[PDB]
Amino acid sequence: LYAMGVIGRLNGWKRYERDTYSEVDIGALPPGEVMQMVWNGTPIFIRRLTSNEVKEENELPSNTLLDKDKEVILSDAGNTKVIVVSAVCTHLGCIPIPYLGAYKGYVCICHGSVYDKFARVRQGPALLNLPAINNSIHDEGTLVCMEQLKFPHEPSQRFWA
Amino acid sequence: YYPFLWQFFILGTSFVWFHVCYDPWLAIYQANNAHRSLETALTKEKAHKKKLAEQEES
Amino acid sequence: FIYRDDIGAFWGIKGYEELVTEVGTHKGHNYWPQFSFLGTYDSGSVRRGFQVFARNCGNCHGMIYKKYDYLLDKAYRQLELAQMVSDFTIHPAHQHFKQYYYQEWDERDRVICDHIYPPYFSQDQAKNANGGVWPTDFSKIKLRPGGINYIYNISTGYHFTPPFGMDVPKGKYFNPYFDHMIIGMPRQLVDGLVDYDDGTPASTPQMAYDVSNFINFMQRRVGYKRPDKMVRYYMVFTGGLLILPFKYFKTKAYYRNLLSLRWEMYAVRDGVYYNHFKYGGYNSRAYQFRGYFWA
Amino acid sequence: FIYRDDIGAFWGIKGYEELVTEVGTHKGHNYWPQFSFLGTYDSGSVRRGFQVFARNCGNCHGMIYKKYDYLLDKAYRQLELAQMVSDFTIHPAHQHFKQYYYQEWDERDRVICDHIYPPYFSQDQAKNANGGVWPTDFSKIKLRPGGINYIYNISTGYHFTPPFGMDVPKGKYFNPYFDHMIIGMPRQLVDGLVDYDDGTPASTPQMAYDVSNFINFMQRRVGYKRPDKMVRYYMVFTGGLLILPFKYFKTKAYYRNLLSLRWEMYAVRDGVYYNHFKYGGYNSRAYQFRGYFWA
Amino acid sequence: MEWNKGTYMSTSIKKIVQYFSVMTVSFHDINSLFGFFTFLTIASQLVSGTMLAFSLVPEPMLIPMVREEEDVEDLYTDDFFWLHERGVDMLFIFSYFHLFRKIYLNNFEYEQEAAWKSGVFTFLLFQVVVFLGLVLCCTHLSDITLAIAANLYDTFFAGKGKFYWWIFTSKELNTDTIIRLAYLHYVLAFFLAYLGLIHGVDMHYDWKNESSMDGLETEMIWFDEALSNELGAMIEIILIVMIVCFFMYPEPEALSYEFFMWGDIGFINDVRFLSVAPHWYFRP
Amino acid sequence: MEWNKGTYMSTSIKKIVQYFSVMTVSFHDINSLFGFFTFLTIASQLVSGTMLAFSLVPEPMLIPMVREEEDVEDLYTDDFFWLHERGVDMLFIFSYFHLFRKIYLNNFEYEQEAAWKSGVFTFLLFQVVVFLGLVLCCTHLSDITLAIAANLYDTFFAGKGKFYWWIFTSKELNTDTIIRLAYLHYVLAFFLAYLGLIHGVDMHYDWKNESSMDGLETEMIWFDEALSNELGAMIEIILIVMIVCFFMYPEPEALSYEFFMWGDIGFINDVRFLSVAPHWYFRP
Ligand SMILES: CCCCCCCCCCCCCCCCCC(=O)OC[C@H](COP(=O)([O-])OCC(O)COP(=O)([O-])OC[C@@H](COC(=O)CCCCCCCCCCCCCCCCC)OC(=O)CCCCCCCCCCCCCCCCC)OC(=O)CCCCCCCCCCCCCCCCC
Ligand SMILES: CCCCCCCCCCCCCCCCCC(=O)OC[C@H](COP(=O)([O-])OCC[N+](C)(C)C)OC(=O)CCCCCCCCCCCCCCCCC
Ligand SMILES: CCCCCCCCCCCCCCCCCC(=O)OC[C@H](COP(=O)([O-])OCC[N+](C)(C)C)OC(=O)CCCCCCCCCCCCCCCCC
Ligand SMILES: CCCCCCCCCCCCCCCCCC(=O)OC[C@H](COP(=O)([O-])OCC[N+](C)(C)C)OC(=O)CCCCCCCCCCCCCCCCC
Ligand SMILES: COC1=C(OC)C(=O)C(C/C=C(\C)CC/C=C(\C)CC/C=C(/C)CC/C=C(/C)CC/C=C(/C)CC/C=C(\C)CC/C=C(\C)CCC=C(C)C)=C(C)C1=O
Ligand SMILES: COC1=C(OC)C(=O)C(C/C=C(\C)CC/C=C(\C)CC/C=C(/C)CC/C=C(\C)CC/C=C(/C)CC/C=C(\C)CC/C=C(\C)CCC=C(C)C)=C(C)C1=O
Ligand code: HEC
Ligand code: HEC
Ligand code: HEM
Ligand code: HEM
Ligand code: HEM
Ligand code: HEM
Ligand code: FES
């Protein structure tokens, strides 16, 4: 009991998770457009992808798919797909450029960290893709509900009764 | 032959050390910066204020 | 070991390669009375610098770490400083930590003990008011390329035009002394902007010089205490030079005197055997060798 | 050792002879669920207490130390509490330690993470708005006579009239439970003042009870954590009682077992002398006796 | 320092380990164990107190708010604060009972001197530590305690000069005074452990259960036979104290000496002088 | 613990005083005095850090303002801070010169083992303390140092289960982290003194200013004959350092390494990652 007390004092306790839920209206967004939003005081890029753009983006050599272990989530809500990603250079934290001529993706001026429309690492010293923001679509593409991923924090019972 | 008197002598020598190393540098430093004191600025401001006050309109 | 002088890094300190940083220190020598040998702040210069800071550039910037009362001996007197600073107001929202001492609930005239806050309550308010870019806090601003010169250069380096390939966005201005040569501050110093109390001509170089002197004076290491500490260093160095001979007498001559020894060795051939040498000796670390070594 | 009750000091604790202290604790027993054996806070009671404190109190009082999110797991949920607390506003002047975190320059809706501040920016503003007397901060208010009963008594005890020789100044009211029985708070609780969300009848005794429960819920040693600690004390006492027999076995019966010795003294008449007794023995502190004692 | 003849027992780690693994204890009773109860409780104060060190910011204007916020957000912080507070009381009780037991036994003889003085010094230091701890509460009780201590300290100098400033800066609880007193409190609290170890080593020379000299030569082994009994007796005394406190201290009480601790310095400038009372140990 | 045979010296006050009053030192040069300079710098670091501790409030958001304001209102505080920084610099210089000198003389022999390792351990601890000290500055340099240290600590655990939280809470400098690291810094800084004393006692077993075995048997008495020379050599090296710093570092400079210490944690969020550089001793 005494040791539990000591160690628990050393390791802070997260008694509850602060609300971060948000909703963004995106139904009216024209297809093939990128909109910048602020979530948790951080930039985020939301884009609508048509069927044609998938052929261009996904048809690249497998070797160029740096960090192949990563997964890409496409909402596929409404007529066209909706992708929500975090706008930050994982190498140092700068905001990647929304557009570039070579690819219809995101690139970084700092070190040429090229990211395609799926945020895959391309020709970049970065060790990861653009961070993926937990979200979902429930209004048939009209509205996107976003909330930070909930990790387990224990003990979660503040009162016995 | 009186140890505490010799300790007073050592204290006196340390005092002489301090004053020798202190007085000349302070004197020369405050002689060099005589014209940079606040009193010079105050005198200049007072003179300018007097000149502006004497020559003016209603 | 040898660092190229045209890379843009001074003495090998990489970074700051999109700035003009060697002006006034390495290339050119701007004279500041504070940093000269046996130099000191010019009281009039710092006085005029505070005057210009209060009448302008105090509407965007501030020294949260500093307070006015630093100017009580070399730049102002208590009554004069109080009267000058009573022209500004501080809401309780300005305070960084009220701590129950600040009981005001409305704007009140500043006192010399108040920290130098900007007119804005917070950094975000200033950033919003100035086109989304925050006027940097001048406390601890000593840590900039060129040191004291950094304030002087930026305030004055609005004359050059951008080269080809560099675009200055609307609301931004070209200034080679700032990071990446784009700065969000419109030029503020204009001839005749501030009427000095001593009648000194108010030309933009003079105002920049006075501002730089004041800002430097408000620092802690390279500020109002550096000259006296340098004089103290000189005095201590003189004391060490004077004490070196006595150290020599105490230590080296004394050791040489102690080594003036006469040695003599004779031939002892009496019957006594050197049994003490054969059976003798003590080692303080014998406990570390017993049962471990040479068995 | 024996004390007197007619004096007006409970159990011999002087200093509170100018007010009623034994109303509901010593001479009376007002039932509170929290302090009952195996008792716990009534969630409805604390909910109603917060509802009352947010509609009548709070506009004068506050808890600088406490914040709303204390009520997350017992009285209110996160969304409900956020909805309730969004009706209030905090200026940046409220913050005890504004810090760099709070970057607002105007009023904004409160959040459950905000500390419970009164509408006034400081104590002096409250005194100015309340006739020169400061509405006491309810945080740490547990340290008043009667404990949780205090809030209940003052909220209710306004019906009595002053005796001869006591003058109630204009703007003051007679309340026997307050220090010197003169309080600057007008009677706040009136039947029907607050319409509860749960439909509970709104009468001054019920409102006082709910407010007292809520105010006690925010305390540190007493309040939301006391009942669990009481249960823990019960559990630890049970553990000690259950461990006592094993301690007995391991210590006292064991010593009794070790003491079961047999002794036998024989006649040794051999020629040997008892030299060891005559010439023997050592003492650890001999160095403390040598050269000092018995010579 | 030729006047010093050395030390009773070298406190080298190996020598301490051997001494305590070979030490024997004569058969005893509960009354002759308060000293151990005085040490074990200290062994908790160093722990619990340490957990409070990481919580308390020595700024006077933040100590109350920091404590209140850490009670909720952090877990076991209030538990350790309660443990520390009650450990002070238990330590006073155990130390005074030990003092009374040793006075009753006529332990003033010369062979007891090393045991006695070495103990009393620790006790003296303990008092000082306790004083410092009070000042860290930043309540009106701390204000009064600091004022009284500063007045007593100044009485030595006859009220001339400001020789008290180096620790009692302005005779008020401010950032400087709080920081210095808190750090000294920690340092002296940890020094108490060494002083108690020295006292325990010294006292074994002539340790006896009762004045009458039992002719018993066999003894227990300290590590488990005596240690288990001491821990069990500590458990029993804790049970007794809890039972007593249950009846004597109902949580809702009409009056208590703790009410004077309501005021927090800086937040409340008005001190209720009518009801001024310290904790029971400093009451006399 | 039968494997541990004992200790070379019992560090008791009586025996320490006797040993240092009867110590003898063979004739030497300045190259074999870097250890004394390191110890003296350690002593001055202890004193100056104790003076600084009474000024530094461990809250991150107040350390910059507190440092700036207490340099003016209080005299000698900035002097002690400068003395502390320059003492750290000179301590690193002396320690590395001592290490190079002892590597030069081929002191890896068995008879040097106790002398060597006891020293290195001290050096190792001397590293840790320095790290903690950096964190107390609460600048962007401190932020980067803490982040790097936390990542290195988390490397051993493969980034699983936040084993770093007990010290590097969130891998960021906050109230808890600053308090814990400041207290650990103070305690380990004071422990360095005892480690240095142990090393100095051990190393005297076989001490040589040069590898060649001089046949001299007479030796200097340490208290004044050797101590005066040690102090004088310290004075000479300090004069040389003052001259070199005065000429190599012009009063105003462009592109110094301290320019990365402009950013203060909390006040400034954005970090100029282009120019990230630690102090020269952690530069390698
Ligand atoms: C609430 C209030 C509480 C109370 C507060 C007040 C506390 C008072 C404490 C009193 C302590 C008494 C100590 C007695 C010994 C002192 C030395 C001695 O014998 O004196 C005779 C000596 C006679 O003169 P002398 O014939 O020329 O001989 C000179 C030699 O010292 C003659 O030495 P030597 O060459 O013959 O041999 C020296 C040494 C041979 O050399 C050594 O072995 C040296 C020691 C080696 C080990 C330690 C290494 C570190 C060195 C010592 C520490 C120095 C720094 C201390 C820093 C303190 C913090 C700042 O041999 C010994 O003497 C062996 C014993 C050494 C002393 C230790 C044992 C006795 C004292 C302690 C006993 C108890 C244990 C300690 C813990 C107690 C805790 C309660 O008197 C003096 O010379 C005194 C001069 C004083 C004036 C000059 C300095 C002034 C300071 C200037 C700085 C600015 C401040 C100004 C002052 C402000 C007001 C204070
Ligand atoms: C009087 C007896 C003295 C000691 C007897 C020794 C023999 C013990 C015999 C076995 C006992 C077994 C039952 C132990 C039950 C403990 C409570 C429990 O289970 O809670 C676990 C809980 C965890 O419960 P949980 O994991 O179910 O989560 C609930 C969390 N709370 C309570 C917040 C709602 O852990 C603790 O609380 C640990 C102790 C607190 C932290 C450290 C400080 C301790 C301070 C003293 C507390 C005890 C007071 C009385 C004694 C004082 C010291 C002498
Ligand atoms: C910056 C780093 C490098 C340089 C550092 C600068 C030096 C700092 C420390 C200097 C200490 C003083 C010099 C000591 C040299 C050794 C002297 C010696 O052996 O003694 C014999 C000498 C004199 O002996 P003598 O034999 O040469 O001559 C006297 C003999 N008769 C009388 C017969 C002629 O002692 C002195 O003169 C002074 C001794 C002072 C005591 C020694 C320790 C001093 C430590 C400093 C702090 C003291 C505080 C005292 C107050 C209490 C505060 C709590
Ligand atoms: C605790 C602070 C200690 C500060 C130490 C700083 C050094 C001060 C002295 C500097 C040099 C000046 C010397 C002047 C001449 C002195 C001659 C003399 O008297 O000789 C003494 C003699 C000298 O030693 P000696 O007899 O071995 O000398 C032999 C001869 N020589 C030195 C030449 C080799 O020794 C003593 O009697 C030492 C007494 C020390 C007393 C220390 C008391 C400290 C009390 C602190 C507070 C205690 C609180 C307790 C808890 C309370 C709880 C409520
Ligand atoms: C002479 O008379 C005397 C007496 O008799 C009356 C006394 O009673 C006394 C009183 C005695 C005391 C207060 C002493 C009693 C002390 C008490 C109760 C408190 C301290 C008790 C302890 C057991 C301290 C133990 C300290 C520790 C650091 C060890 C922690 C304990 C345990 C079980 C863990 C041990 C294991 C580890 C450290 C290793 C764990 C990790 C691994 C194996 C993984 C390693 C690998 C990787 C990769 C990390 C005295 C002084 C006396 O003088
Ligand atoms: C893993 O986590 C951990 C840590 O963090 C990571 C740790 O730091 C630690 C260790 C650290 C701690 C427990 C915190 C300890 C902190 C320390 C030691 C920092 C402080 C260090 C110092 C050197 C402080 C020195 C202070 C001073 C000199 C202040 C002097 C002040 C005073 C009042 C001195 C004068 C007074 C006295 C001596 C008291 C005597 C009595 C009187 C004067 C009576 C007066 C009254 C009257 C009536 C006369 C551990 C164990 C840990 O586990
Ligand atoms: C409001 C109109 C301002 C006035 C009046 C002054 N300055 Fe300013 N300054 C202002 C802004 C919005 C900025 C940010 C520019 C950017 O691109 O970030 C600045 C910046 C500076 C700087 C550089 C700070 C840095 O961290 O590099 C300096 C040295 C500076 N300003 C100086 C300065 C002087 C000397 C002024 C007259 C005394 C002055 N400023 C007035 C906005 C405003
Ligand atoms: C403004 C009209 C107030 C409202 C609404 C409430 N209270 Fe109040 N209270 C007010 C003042 C000006 C004072 C100070 C009176 C004095 O003489 O100092 C108080 C005081 C109290 C107290 C006693 C404080 C003390 O330190 O003893 C209590 C217990 C109290 N108030 C309770 C209380 C409750 C429960 C309220 C909601 C029903 C409430 N107050 C509202 C002013 C005002
Ligand atoms: C912090 C305060 C103290 C601590 C931690 C402490 C600790 C101890 C311990 C552990 C023992 C051995 C177990 C036992 O008591 O039987 C002991 C014995 C003893 N202590 Fe203490 N004690 C303290 C205060 C005192 C005081 C105030 C005195 C005397 C006034 C004192 C004098 C003694 C004596 C005389 C003995 C027994 C020696 C004998 O019988 O001859 N101690 N103490
Ligand atoms: C024998 C050892 C100790 C004793 C006798 C002691 C005594 C006390 C006392 C009397 C108090 C205040 C009592 C009260 O609040 O009613 C206190 C509080 C405190 N103690 Fe100790 N203490 C000891 C050890 C320690 C140690 C070692 C530390 C830190 C390393 C420490 C840290 C604290 C802190 C921080 C507080 C105030 C906590 C707060 O106000 O929130 N204590 N102590
Ligand atoms: C050998 C002993 C010590 C070493 C090597 C050491 C090292 C350091 C270093 C490297 C720094 C940062 C300097 C900088 O970044 O420029 C520092 C800061 C600091 N140290 Fe130490 N230290 C020692 C002893 C102590 C002690 C004993 C204390 C307190 C009792 C202490 C308190 C502090 C404080 C308060 C700061 C920060 C001061 C400020 O930020 O204004 N130090 N130390
Ligand atoms: C803060 C760190 C250190 C301190 C305070 C310290 C202290 C000292 C002192 C005072 C001496 C005697 C004077 C001298 O020999 O110059 C010494 C000698 C010595 N040191 Fe250290 N030292 C430190 C670090 C080291 C390191 C890093 C090493 C090796 C890696 C080391 C190994 C030795 C050895 C072997 C000697 C004896 C030399 C010989 O026998 O000739 N020490 N030390
Ligand atoms: S900073 Fe954006 S890629 Fe290196």
Numbering used by the authors:
A (entry chain e): 109 to 269
B (entry chain I): 61 to 118
C (entry chain D), D (entry chain d): 25 to 319
E (entry chain C), F (entry chain c): 1 to 284
Paper text:
Mitochondrial energy conversion requires an electron transport chain (ETC) that generates a proton motive force across the inner mitochondrial membrane to drive the essential adenosine triphosphate (ATP) formation by F1Fo-ATP synthase. The ETC consists of four multisubunit membrane complexes: complex I (CI; NADH:ubiquinone (UQ) oxidoreductase), complex II (CII; succinate:UQ oxidoreductase), complex III (CIII; cytochrome bc1) and complex IV (CIV; cytochrome c oxidase). We purified the intact respiratory supercomplex from mitochondria of the ciliate protist Tetrahymena thermophila and determined its structure by single-particle cryo-electron microscopy (cryo-EM). Here we show that a supercomplex containing all four respiratory chain components contributes to membrane curvature induction in ciliates.
